[PDB]
Amino acid sequence: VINTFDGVADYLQTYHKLPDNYITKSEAQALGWVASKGNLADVAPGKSIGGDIFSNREGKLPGKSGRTWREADINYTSGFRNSDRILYSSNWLIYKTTDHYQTFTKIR
Numbered sequence: 001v002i003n004t005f006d007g008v009a010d011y012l013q014t015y016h017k018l019p020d021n022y023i024t025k026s027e028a029q030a031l032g033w034v035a036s037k038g039n040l041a042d043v044a045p046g047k048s049i050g051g052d053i054f055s056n057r058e059g060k061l062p063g064k065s066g067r068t069w070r071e072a073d074i075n076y077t078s079g080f081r082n083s084d085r086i087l088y089s090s091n092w093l094i095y096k097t098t099d100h101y102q103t104f105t106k107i108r
Helices: 005-015 025-031
Strands: 048-054 071-073 085-088 096-097
Touching: 005 085, 005 096, 048 096
Parallel strands: none
Antiparallel strands: 048 071, 071 085, 085 096
């Protein structure tokens, strides 16, 4: 249920954590998620990938010492993962990408 840009953004800034429907890539994989098969919804009903650290090696997102960036899939329900991601920092800055991390815009 909580997988939209606004629902997830507002949850991160309030709860300071991703909702219960998010699991990391490693947790998904251990449950049987095979990216090439687009089977996430089959092996982890109702879950989206999220919570993994985003390197930000391209300097597109703002930097700062001790700042860690994390991503979460947005708008996912079934099949292959889409291209919508929410990016959130340790101090709860919220960015969006809809083009597979090519470009970001601030949303909070």
